Amino acid sequence: MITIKKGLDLPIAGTPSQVISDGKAIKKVALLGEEYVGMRPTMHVRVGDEVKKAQILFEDKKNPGVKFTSPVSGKVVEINRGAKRVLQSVVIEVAGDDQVTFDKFEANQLASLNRDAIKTQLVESGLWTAFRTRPFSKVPAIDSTSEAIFVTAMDTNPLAAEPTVVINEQSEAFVAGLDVLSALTTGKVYVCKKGTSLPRSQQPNVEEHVFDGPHPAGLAGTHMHFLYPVSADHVAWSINYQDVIAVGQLFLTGELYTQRVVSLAGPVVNKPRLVRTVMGASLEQLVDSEIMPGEVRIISGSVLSGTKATGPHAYLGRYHLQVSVLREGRDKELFGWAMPGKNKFSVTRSFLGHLFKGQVYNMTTTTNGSDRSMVPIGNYEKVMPLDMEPTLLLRDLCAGDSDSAVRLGALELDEEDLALCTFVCPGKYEYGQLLRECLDKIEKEG
Amino acid sequence: MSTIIFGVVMFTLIILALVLVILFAKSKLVPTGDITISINGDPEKAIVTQPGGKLLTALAGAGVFVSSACGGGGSCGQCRVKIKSGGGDILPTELDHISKGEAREGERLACQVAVKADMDLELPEEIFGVKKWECTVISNDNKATFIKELKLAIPDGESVPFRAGGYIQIEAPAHHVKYADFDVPEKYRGDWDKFNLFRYESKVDEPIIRAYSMANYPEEFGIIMLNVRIATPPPNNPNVPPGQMSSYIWSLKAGDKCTISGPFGEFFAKDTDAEMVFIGGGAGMAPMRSHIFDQLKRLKSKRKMSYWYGARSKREMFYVEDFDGLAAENDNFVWHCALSDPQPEDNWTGYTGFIHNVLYENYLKDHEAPEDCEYYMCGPPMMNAAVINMLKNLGVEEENILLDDFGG
Amino acid sequence: KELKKSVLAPVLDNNPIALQVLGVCSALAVTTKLETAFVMTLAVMFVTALSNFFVSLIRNHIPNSVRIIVQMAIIASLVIVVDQILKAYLYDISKQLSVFVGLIITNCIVMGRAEAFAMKSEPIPSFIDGIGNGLGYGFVLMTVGFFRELLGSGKLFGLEVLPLISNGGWYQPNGLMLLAPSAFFLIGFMIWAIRTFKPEQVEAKE
Amino acid sequence: DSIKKTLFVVIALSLVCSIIVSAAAVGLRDKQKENAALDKQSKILQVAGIEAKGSKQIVELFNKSIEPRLVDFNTGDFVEGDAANYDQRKAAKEASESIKLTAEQDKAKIQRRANVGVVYLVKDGDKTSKVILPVHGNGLWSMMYAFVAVETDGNTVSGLTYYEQGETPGLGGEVENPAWRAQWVGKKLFDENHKPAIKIVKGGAPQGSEHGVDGLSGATLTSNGVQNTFDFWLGDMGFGPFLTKVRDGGL
Amino acid sequence: MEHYISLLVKSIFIENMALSFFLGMCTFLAVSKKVKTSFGLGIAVIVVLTISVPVNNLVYNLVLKPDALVEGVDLSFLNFITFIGVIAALVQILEMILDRFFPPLYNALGIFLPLITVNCAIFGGVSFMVQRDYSFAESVVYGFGSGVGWMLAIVALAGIREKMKYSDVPPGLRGLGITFITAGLMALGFMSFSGVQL
Amino acid sequence: GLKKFLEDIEHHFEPGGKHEKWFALYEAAATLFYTPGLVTKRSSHVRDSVDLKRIMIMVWLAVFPAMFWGMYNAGGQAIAALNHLYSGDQLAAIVAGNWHYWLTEMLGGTMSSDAGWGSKMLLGATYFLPIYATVFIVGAFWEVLFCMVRKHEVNEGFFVTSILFALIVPPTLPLWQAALGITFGVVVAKEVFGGTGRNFLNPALAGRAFLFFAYPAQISGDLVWTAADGYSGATALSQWAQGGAGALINNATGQTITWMDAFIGNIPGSIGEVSTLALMIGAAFIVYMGIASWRIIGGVMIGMILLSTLFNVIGSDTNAMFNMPWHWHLVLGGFAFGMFFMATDPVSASFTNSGKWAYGILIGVMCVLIRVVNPAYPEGMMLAILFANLFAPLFDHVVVERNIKRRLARYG
Ligand SMILES: Cc1cc2nc3c(=O)[nH]c(=O)nc-3n(C[C@H](O)[C@H](O)[C@H](O)COP(=O)(O)OP(=O)(O)OC[C@H]3O[C@@H](n4cnc5c(N)ncnc54)[C@H](O)[C@@H]3O)c2cc1C
Ligand SMILES: Cc1cc2nc3c(=O)[nH]c(=O)nc-3n(C[C@H](O)[C@H](O)[C@H](O)COP(=O)(O)O)c2cc1C
Ligand SMILES: Cc1cc2nc3c(=O)[nH]c(=O)nc-3n(C[C@H](O)[C@H](O)[C@H](O)COP(=O)(O)O)c2cc1C
Ligand code: FES
Ligand code: FES
Ligand SMILES: [Ca+2]
């Protein structure tokens, strides 16, 4: 067991009740084009076309052979594009139940299937995009393999759902997906989890590892750092538990399984809870009559890392398992920076808030100050548990020294790995953008 | 007085002793034997020289220039070679032209690498077919007001192996020429006499070498031809003379003796099924014609194609009797031209203005998926920049944009 | 007139200290008095000019193996003669210059110009180049010395300009102007001003 | 190319350069030595109370108005030797020509004393009017050297100048201030019982006194060195044995 | 042992050749861009200085000083030529040795060598040795300590300049001017040893 | 309404307005009075409450007890010395000839020996306040000039630099010298590097070093540490250097300086350094808040203790500074002030946890070393901190290189 000590469990209000319930009716879904790293699409559909479930919508120019498919049967109603004609989303209006089907196998045959057959089925069904690669968090090339596949069976994000509740309803599918992953991998499968019990695969190369402590104890980056360090010559793959259930369902029934269970929570949600939805569901329709009046922001994912769901982006992301809602903090306060902030959160002890243990805050989207240069009072070390130098790495990212950042350990990181550092920055830097720019340069230079 | 003699003797003795010690150290330490360099692993075509200096000195003796276009400056960056053996490291001065991935592949600049030790070299695509030729000028006439069409003959009916869009090496001797001697006809002379371009002259005291692009496709057997523009000085500082090589080429006529060599190129078309769009202007007509003829006559392809040309006036354009014939014999080709200087005697009723705006406003703004097309480019640098910006705003990534810029 | 073009270029266009990095040690050391700055400027100018002249005279015969030995022999002979003359006629100033009369040999300007220009040029052009580089060096030395001496002692060439409180005046000298950090800061601000008025010399961002 | 050519070129160049260098170096030695001597003679004339302008006048006045002499510290008697070319500073470093002082005796922190020291007698016709004693001691930053002119009674100071010191110009360099140097004239080196009595007084000496002089303002660490210089050089290990002879009319 | 330890400490800190005497400034300012490049240059300086000072001590004591060869004859006007000749020949010999036998040591420290003959630190160290009249062992220790101090100073400057990757310097100060100001500030802090009577 | 006024006059400072060149000052005032009111654009949609404004205001408040005790102590020392030296009509004439004295008496105070804490504090204020005002105004001029020329926004940090500079000078410092010192500190040490967060030296100590080496006669010696006309008196560190613990006597009152006196702050010296207790009370708050580095403070203490005990064990017959123990090193001079408020500057210190220990240890070792074996200077805290600023990045380099080794071994 690994115990994380440096971290932060954000005490935000509106904690979901871990009980699953039916969700609202969904009439639109979409695939978000900008959430895939390095993707340049080639469109296989145009507005007005009718599509089936698992039918291809577009391919990737820079990743040949990878197919992005439709999660529902219906009609293509919108193909949204932005600056420089970048694809934002492809919106399908639900209608009918047509689908493309694949091969199905018995539960005991899954552990010994051919790797090429597994890869063909996944790529054709479009479920191949559930995987991501560290470094660079990209969809793996269909011709490559990896020694380590990490399954994320825990969630430490604030207001996140409980993976145990979801998995206990789909034990057979979870185990079948683990068997398929064991056959797919060239080395081992790492099932990262908390201390409680889960369904287990009987294969010898599937291993369970328990992680303890606050956020980011539940991140695949932390798990990789502690069990299989990654570099330019060691590449790992990551996939979350619901995608594993989807893989198991795919290889058990020959059909693409697009059901989801997401957490709908936040300070402005009347009844925070877990809701059954569908991949890419419309968040505007999902949160209908679920929120308090006023100006609010709907986030696809966590408040630490997520996508502002407005306009053409108002759809559930591919890699997101929750929806967060909170108010917009546009208030101006007289000498608000100098008040004794009983109701102000901070990782430092400059406010009265930390003296009240167990207090939850109705946090908003305000930035508590203006942009400034870095004055390192030592907040990053309090929240970064990995074996790196946070201040030096962050200053390398700010300065744009990609070569130095790589040496200091940028290749091991995702945007979600610096969310807490962005959170606690007195200068209000946003480090995910800088990390992504650095990684883009590293990939460009070869 | 004795002190003077002592000082002289001691000064001389000390200097001589130091010199002798350093000479002995050099004789014992530095090697004096010969070293060898190999190419593509062959036991033949090896080169043996004394150690020291750049690799270019050794490779120049055998005539393997690898398109080395200058002895200094290095703005082109063409001087790269893959070194296979564990030789010297890549110096800090090479990373501007060689990426980190290429350096990991062994790419090195021949002009910087020191050859003081044995090394092994590999040259891509077996370029050993490069050769020098003795050629006769077939025709050197003009089709416009500032460009001239040079044709060359290859003896015994032989044909040089090449691919469309490539360029060749060309050399000239010491010469002096004056612009009044050129054969500009009456219709084009109207512009020359306005600036009095006949007043200019140029010279050089030693032979020179340059690179120029070819204007024919593989099945145009037996000849090599090029399109050359004049190189008059800028008007703000007219005291300087015009260009050397262009003036030299403009002087020759039918039957004259000339020498060429070094057919190279990296502007070759891709082999996909996507649409092809050809945008050109001014003197860049040569590679555009080469590619258009190649894809339509030799390969006989059915891919969609179109050629957009930016001219100056109705008397500045040429090869329309070829492009219109192509557009009629093949339904997969279309030609359009726009000019920036329509004089009243033209009464032009077609497109006007810079070609990029015409292209955007007539074809691309309503194109179904412009990012899937392939764009082949050649022309003035500023118009290239305008076109590249217009294509950037349409979401076309660099992999689908190709350009062979004249003059770098 | 190419001669005046060549002599004046190293003053502001290619200044040895402000654009090239050469001859900084003496600039830091001998600029607390304008008289010593002036004498050092003249000595460096003379030595550089004559070294360039002779090296270019024998440039075609220098054996490549011991060219450094030959060049340093010439330079050291000239500097030794200069040292003898200074100790014979300017004893006090030679005392003040201390070990830096000998360090004219390793003053980077002399060797830099001898190697870069003299080995590749004719005698008279090499002499002119040496004179011009000496002028460029003297510009910085004299300007730094002016401020250092004036603000550190209220004097110029030893003549009283700002009466001192000790002598009964009104000015309190700055003690930091008599130490190296003042020269460092002054040269830095000089480079700032020069590259403000001639922005073509600004270095590219890394 | 040929080692023969290399050797020929280097040898010829060395011959020319060496001839020039040696001729120049040997031709100017006398003038350099004259400059060095005149530098010292100017200071000695200055402290002697004689005005001289120019090298010629300095030489003329020094030759006829000053008579260098050698003195043995242990016995205070004059010694044979060429006083005009003696180098006490180097003689203090040679083992046979000097002694190592004791931690108690080394009050001025000089660490050594030469066996014989040079003194300069000031002439007035054939009569001797003053004797100039060279003294030195450690300050806060450097070793400080001075000349002190004493009358023929062996007690009264006629003047004092520090001709070599390296203290801070504002705090410790004020030993060279003419106004501070003027205070020394008329002071008595010894009390009525012939013990050293020069005192550097912090905060200013009492008005009208004949044993005390003002200390350097804000520079006590240099005033201490100045005090120690005289504490040592007026004692038995310095010019005390010679000054008793001088007091007894031995001039 | 205390005498030589005191000499070494004085050479390194109390009398740092880079930030107390201010010699070698041209390369101290130009090559301070990267820590490890400065480290290699400093190692080369250490070697050259610690071999140069003793050899010049021997030559001066056996030939040049007054009454060394014949009585009444001194050759001390040859000091400069002898010093610089020894330094140049030694630098070239060691440059050839490193490239010939130890290519990996050449890549580390030999590549910097052509210019370190013209480096005021070496010549000034030899001159100070002659002025102070050291012994042979004292000369060895003094040269080694001076080289070590110069290396320390240049490596500290390189560290500062690498820390400055996050700075925003005005365009007219980028490079030479700001490095000059940084060196002045370093000299400001090194004055803590000024009054030490070691 | 200030809120309505600020947004009413906004259009004047927008581009093309009447006052478009004073936009930096306008926005500074606006965000001083109210908060920006902005939201998050990207990345973490929630942010921590802390900001540079609160960091700087906390550091500024931490020194208030020290500043007030410093004013009171300066006044008391001056009055005691004046009454020791003069009395009667001579004292009346001395008072009439100094504005610091006759202003105090005009505002209702007294300069007699029975003066109370109010009179002493007022007399100290008439020395402290002019220095602080001059420093702040002169430095703000340069800050605003740089911001306007480079179109930056005026940030916080000079708010702390100014007070820290004003608290580390003798009560008698000339105002033109104070102006020159702050000019040097702000411009040469901070602004040319890009401003707050982008330098490597301590701006406040850089100006103090400038004064120290340019005008030593006004920031050293016996004539500057007590603001009494014509009074000459040494202070504890000088007296120890002269004669050991037995030499610690306050000549203004004839009493013996004790450890309790030095700890409470009943001794002359720089305005804000004297009270170790008052400095400790302030430092505890900012250490608890997590703004100051207890690793740096512990390193400084470790180094001081180790080197002082080594000197005590070695011993000496002629140097009385060898036998001063660590608990006496603690309470004399500016050691406590430097350790608590100047060695903890985040920008000038090491950025690594391991590096901070070495940084503090070096500062302490250098301070004790300069105190003991350097006869020119009685104190060494300023020089020690300025010297350790040069080597902090080298400690960072060593630590990060070890980290890179671990990483390449696939364990990090
Ligand atoms: C691979 C390749 C292929 C090419 N193919 C073609 C082709 O097919 N057709 C074509 O037309 N072009 C082509 N070019 C471009 C052409 O080679 C050049 O643009 C140019 O025309 C070459 O002219 P030149 O060598 O005769 O004259 P150059 O002597 O190269 O021209 C020198 C110019 O610089 C000016 N100059 C010199 N000194 C100064 C000074 N101090 N200040 C100001 N001005 C100064 C001269 O007056 C003159 O204008 C090609 C270029 C490349 C790289
Ligand atoms: C930069 C600097 C240089 C100093 N130089 C000297 C000096 O040369 N001589 C000296 O006596 N004091 C000098 N001092 C002052 C001493 O440090 C010390 O304060 C003084 O000797 C105390 O004298 P006092 O006891 O009479 O007050 C200097 C101070 C500073 C800051
Ligand atoms: C932060 C700080 C740093 C100081 N640094 C020095 C210093 O480096 N050198 C010095 O002589 N005095 C320095 N001082 C001043 C002394 O601490 C003290 O105020 C002064 O020397 C008074 O004399 P004393 O040392 O006898 O008490 C500093 C003061 C402070 C507050
Ligand atoms: S051709 Fe570019 S470096 Fe030689
Ligand atoms: S002048 Fe001293 S190293 Fe260049
Ligand atoms: Ca002596």
PDB file of all heavy atoms in Angstrom, chain A residues 26 28-31 71 258 260 277-283 314-318:
ATOM      1  N   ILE A  26     -32.602  12.569 -22.646  1.00  0.00           N
ATOM      2  CA  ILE A  26     -31.563  13.179 -23.469  1.00  0.00           C
ATOM      3  C   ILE A  26     -31.973  13.038 -24.927  1.00  0.00           C
ATOM      4  O   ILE A  26     -32.304  11.937 -25.383  1.00  0.00           O
ATOM      5  CB  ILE A  26     -30.190  12.538 -23.218  1.00  0.00           C
ATOM      6  CG1 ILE A  26     -29.760  12.743 -21.763  1.00  0.00           C
ATOM      7  CG2 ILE A  26     -29.154  13.114 -24.168  1.00  0.00           C
ATOM      8  CD1 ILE A  26     -29.594  14.196 -21.357  1.00  0.00           C
ATOM      9  N   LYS A  28     -30.031  14.944 -27.451  1.00  0.00           N
ATOM     10  CA  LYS A  28     -28.861  15.276 -28.250  1.00  0.00           C
ATOM     11  C   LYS A  28     -27.610  14.736 -27.577  1.00  0.00           C
ATOM     12  O   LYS A  28     -27.512  14.722 -26.347  1.00  0.00           O
ATOM     13  CB  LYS A  28     -28.716  16.786 -28.434  1.00  0.00           C
ATOM     14  CG  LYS A  28     -29.852  17.445 -29.190  1.00  0.00           C
ATOM     15  CD  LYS A  28     -29.504  18.872 -29.589  1.00  0.00           C
ATOM     16  CE  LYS A  28     -29.080  19.720 -28.396  1.00  0.00           C
ATOM     17  NZ  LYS A  28     -28.765  21.117 -28.796  1.00  0.00           N
ATOM     18  N   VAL A  29     -26.655  14.290 -28.392  1.00  0.00           N
ATOM     19  CA  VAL A  29     -25.321  13.940 -27.930  1.00  0.00           C
ATOM     20  C   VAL A  29     -24.328  14.501 -28.937  1.00  0.00           C
ATOM     21  O   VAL A  29     -24.690  14.881 -30.052  1.00  0.00           O
ATOM     22  CB  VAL A  29     -25.123  12.419 -27.765  1.00  0.00           C
ATOM     23  CG1 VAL A  29     -26.190  11.841 -26.851  1.00  0.00           C
ATOM     24  CG2 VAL A  29     -25.135  11.730 -29.113  1.00  0.00           C
ATOM     25  N   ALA A  30     -23.061  14.557 -28.534  1.00  0.00           N
ATOM     26  CA  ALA A  30     -22.032  15.110 -29.397  1.00  0.00           C
ATOM     27  C   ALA A  30     -20.665  14.563 -29.019  1.00  0.00           C
ATOM     28  O   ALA A  30     -20.425  14.150 -27.882  1.00  0.00           O
ATOM     29  CB  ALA A  30     -22.010  16.641 -29.330  1.00  0.00           C
ATOM     30  N   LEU A  31     -19.769  14.564 -30.003  1.00  0.00           N
ATOM     31  CA  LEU A  31     -18.359  14.286 -29.784  1.00  0.00           C
ATOM     32  C   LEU A  31     -17.570  15.583 -29.870  1.00  0.00           C
ATOM     33  O   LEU A  31     -17.654  16.310 -30.862  1.00  0.00           O
ATOM     34  CB  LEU A  31     -17.829  13.295 -30.821  1.00  0.00           C
ATOM     35  CG  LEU A  31     -17.792  11.823 -30.417  1.00  0.00           C
ATOM     36  CD1 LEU A  31     -19.189  11.260 -30.299  1.00  0.00           C
ATOM     37  CD2 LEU A  31     -16.978  11.032 -31.423  1.00  0.00           C
ATOM     38  N   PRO A  71     -22.153   7.530 -30.603  1.00  0.00           N
ATOM     39  CA  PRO A  71     -22.659   6.791 -29.439  1.00  0.00           C
ATOM     40  C   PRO A  71     -24.142   6.475 -29.496  1.00  0.00           C
ATOM     41  O   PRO A  71     -24.621   5.706 -28.652  1.00  0.00           O
ATOM     42  CB  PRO A  71     -22.349   7.733 -28.271  1.00  0.00           C
ATOM     43  CG  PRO A  71     -22.361   9.084 -28.866  1.00  0.00           C
ATOM     44  CD  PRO A  71     -21.923   8.952 -30.293  1.00  0.00           C
ATOM     45  N   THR A 258     -22.854   2.260 -24.250  1.00  0.00           N
ATOM     46  CA  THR A 258     -22.645   3.695 -24.107  1.00  0.00           C
ATOM     47  C   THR A 258     -23.278   4.268 -22.846  1.00  0.00           C
ATOM     48  O   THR A 258     -23.258   5.487 -22.656  1.00  0.00           O
ATOM     49  CB  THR A 258     -23.193   4.427 -25.334  1.00  0.00           C
ATOM     50  OG1 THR A 258     -24.566   4.067 -25.489  1.00  0.00           O
ATOM     51  CG2 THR A 258     -22.437   4.098 -26.602  1.00  0.00           C
ATOM     52  N   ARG A 260     -23.649   5.460 -19.021  1.00  0.00           N
ATOM     53  CA  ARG A 260     -22.732   6.076 -18.074  1.00  0.00           C
ATOM     54  C   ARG A 260     -23.435   6.262 -16.740  1.00  0.00           C
ATOM     55  O   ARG A 260     -24.664   6.219 -16.656  1.00  0.00           O
ATOM     56  CB  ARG A 260     -22.230   7.438 -18.568  1.00  0.00           C
ATOM     57  CG  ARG A 260     -21.329   7.388 -19.785  1.00  0.00           C
ATOM     58  CD  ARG A 260     -19.890   7.086 -19.413  1.00  0.00           C
ATOM     59  NE  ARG A 260     -19.390   5.896 -20.088  1.00  0.00           N
ATOM     60  CZ  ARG A 260     -18.109   5.639 -20.309  1.00  0.00           C
ATOM     61  NH1 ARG A 260     -17.159   6.466 -19.906  1.00  0.00           N
ATOM     62  NH2 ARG A 260     -17.772   4.528 -20.954  1.00  0.00           N
ATOM     63  N   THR A 277     -26.823   8.352 -17.378  1.00  0.00           N
ATOM     64  CA  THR A 277     -26.836   9.160 -18.591  1.00  0.00           C
ATOM     65  C   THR A 277     -26.198   8.354 -19.718  1.00  0.00           C
ATOM     66  O   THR A 277     -25.954   7.152 -19.584  1.00  0.00           O
ATOM     67  CB  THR A 277     -26.127  10.501 -18.354  1.00  0.00           C
ATOM     68  OG1 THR A 277     -26.385  11.344 -19.477  1.00  0.00           O
ATOM     69  CG2 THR A 277     -24.636  10.355 -18.144  1.00  0.00           C
ATOM     70  N   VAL A 278     -25.910   9.028 -20.828  1.00  0.00           N
ATOM     71  CA  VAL A 278     -25.307   8.412 -22.002  1.00  0.00           C
ATOM     72  C   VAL A 278     -24.078   9.219 -22.392  1.00  0.00           C
ATOM     73  O   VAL A 278     -23.985  10.417 -22.108  1.00  0.00           O
ATOM     74  CB  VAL A 278     -26.307   8.327 -23.178  1.00  0.00           C
ATOM     75  CG1 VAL A 278     -26.809   9.710 -23.556  1.00  0.00           C
ATOM     76  CG2 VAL A 278     -25.672   7.645 -24.378  1.00  0.00           C
ATOM     77  N   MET A 279     -23.129   8.555 -23.048  1.00  0.00           N
ATOM     78  CA  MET A 279     -21.893   9.216 -23.445  1.00  0.00           C
ATOM     79  C   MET A 279     -22.189  10.423 -24.321  1.00  0.00           C
ATOM     80  O   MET A 279     -22.972  10.342 -25.269  1.00  0.00           O
ATOM     81  CB  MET A 279     -20.989   8.236 -24.196  1.00  0.00           C
ATOM     82  CG  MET A 279     -20.386   7.154 -23.317  1.00  0.00           C
ATOM     83  SD  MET A 279     -19.347   5.954 -24.182  1.00  0.00           S
ATOM     84  CE  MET A 279     -18.973   6.795 -25.716  1.00  0.00           C
ATOM     85  N   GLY A 280     -21.553  11.545 -24.000  1.00  0.00           N
ATOM     86  CA  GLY A 280     -21.727  12.757 -24.770  1.00  0.00           C
ATOM     87  C   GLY A 280     -23.064  13.437 -24.597  1.00  0.00           C
ATOM     88  O   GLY A 280     -23.446  14.234 -25.458  1.00  0.00           O
ATOM     89  N   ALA A 281     -23.781  13.159 -23.511  1.00  0.00           N
ATOM     90  CA  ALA A 281     -25.110  13.721 -23.326  1.00  0.00           C
ATOM     91  C   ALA A 281     -25.046  15.240 -23.253  1.00  0.00           C
ATOM     92  O   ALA A 281     -24.010  15.826 -22.930  1.00  0.00           O
ATOM     93  CB  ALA A 281     -25.748  13.163 -22.056  1.00  0.00           C
ATOM     94  N   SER A 282     -26.172  15.877 -23.563  1.00  0.00           N
ATOM     95  CA  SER A 282     -26.264  17.330 -23.504  1.00  0.00           C
ATOM     96  C   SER A 282     -26.406  17.778 -22.054  1.00  0.00           C
ATOM     97  O   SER A 282     -27.373  17.418 -21.377  1.00  0.00           O
ATOM     98  CB  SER A 282     -27.450  17.813 -24.332  1.00  0.00           C
ATOM     99  OG  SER A 282     -27.513  19.227 -24.354  1.00  0.00           O
ATOM    100  N   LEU A 283     -25.446  18.573 -21.581  1.00  0.00           N
ATOM    101  CA  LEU A 283     -25.467  18.992 -20.184  1.00  0.00           C
ATOM    102  C   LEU A 283     -26.570  20.007 -19.917  1.00  0.00           C
ATOM    103  O   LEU A 283     -27.130  20.034 -18.814  1.00  0.00           O
ATOM    104  CB  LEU A 283     -24.106  19.562 -19.793  1.00  0.00           C
ATOM    105  CG  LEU A 283     -22.940  18.575 -19.886  1.00  0.00           C
ATOM    106  CD1 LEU A 283     -21.667  19.209 -19.368  1.00  0.00           C
ATOM    107  CD2 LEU A 283     -23.239  17.291 -19.134  1.00  0.00           C
ATOM    108  N   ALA A 314     -21.310  22.366 -24.765  1.00  0.00           N
ATOM    109  CA  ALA A 314     -22.191  21.991 -23.667  1.00  0.00           C
ATOM    110  C   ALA A 314     -22.544  20.511 -23.712  1.00  0.00           C
ATOM    111  O   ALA A 314     -23.725  20.154 -23.728  1.00  0.00           O
ATOM    112  CB  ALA A 314     -23.468  22.832 -23.702  1.00  0.00           C
ATOM    113  N   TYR A 315     -21.534  19.645 -23.727  1.00  0.00           N
ATOM    114  CA  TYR A 315     -21.740  18.209 -23.815  1.00  0.00           C
ATOM    115  C   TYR A 315     -20.725  17.487 -22.941  1.00  0.00           C
ATOM    116  O   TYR A 315     -19.636  17.999 -22.674  1.00  0.00           O
ATOM    117  CB  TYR A 315     -21.634  17.729 -25.264  1.00  0.00           C
ATOM    118  CG  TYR A 315     -22.640  18.390 -26.175  1.00  0.00           C
ATOM    119  CD1 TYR A 315     -22.318  19.538 -26.877  1.00  0.00           C
ATOM    120  CD2 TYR A 315     -23.920  17.877 -26.315  1.00  0.00           C
ATOM    121  CE1 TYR A 315     -23.234  20.149 -27.700  1.00  0.00           C
ATOM    122  CE2 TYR A 315     -24.842  18.483 -27.136  1.00  0.00           C
ATOM    123  CZ  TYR A 315     -24.494  19.619 -27.826  1.00  0.00           C
ATOM    124  OH  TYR A 315     -25.412  20.227 -28.646  1.00  0.00           O
ATOM    125  N   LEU A 316     -21.097  16.287 -22.503  1.00  0.00           N
ATOM    126  CA  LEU A 316     -20.261  15.521 -21.588  1.00  0.00           C
ATOM    127  C   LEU A 316     -19.015  15.024 -22.311  1.00  0.00           C
ATOM    128  O   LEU A 316     -19.109  14.429 -23.388  1.00  0.00           O
ATOM    129  CB  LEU A 316     -21.057  14.351 -21.017  1.00  0.00           C
ATOM    130  CG  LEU A 316     -20.341  13.431 -20.028  1.00  0.00           C
ATOM    131  CD1 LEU A 316     -19.901  14.196 -18.793  1.00  0.00           C
ATOM    132  CD2 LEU A 316     -21.243  12.273 -19.648  1.00  0.00           C
ATOM    133  N   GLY A 317     -17.851  15.256 -21.712  1.00  0.00           N
ATOM    134  CA  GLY A 317     -16.608  14.877 -22.352  1.00  0.00           C
ATOM    135  C   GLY A 317     -16.410  13.374 -22.385  1.00  0.00           C
ATOM    136  O   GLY A 317     -17.071  12.607 -21.687  1.00  0.00           O
ATOM    137  N   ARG A 318     -15.468  12.955 -23.231  1.00  0.00           N
ATOM    138  CA  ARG A 318     -15.185  11.532 -23.381  1.00  0.00           C
ATOM    139  C   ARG A 318     -14.597  10.941 -22.109  1.00  0.00           C
ATOM    140  O   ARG A 318     -14.932   9.811 -21.737  1.00  0.00           O
ATOM    141  CB  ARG A 318     -14.229  11.314 -24.553  1.00  0.00           C
ATOM    142  CG  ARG A 318     -13.928   9.857 -24.877  1.00  0.00           C
ATOM    143  CD  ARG A 318     -15.175   9.100 -25.299  1.00  0.00           C
ATOM    144  NE  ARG A 318     -14.915   7.681 -25.506  1.00  0.00           N
ATOM    145  CZ  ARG A 318     -14.831   6.781 -24.536  1.00  0.00           C
ATOM    146  NH1 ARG A 318     -14.973   7.118 -23.266  1.00  0.00           N
ATOM    147  NH2 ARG A 318     -14.602   5.511 -24.850  1.00  0.00           N
TER     148      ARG A 318
END
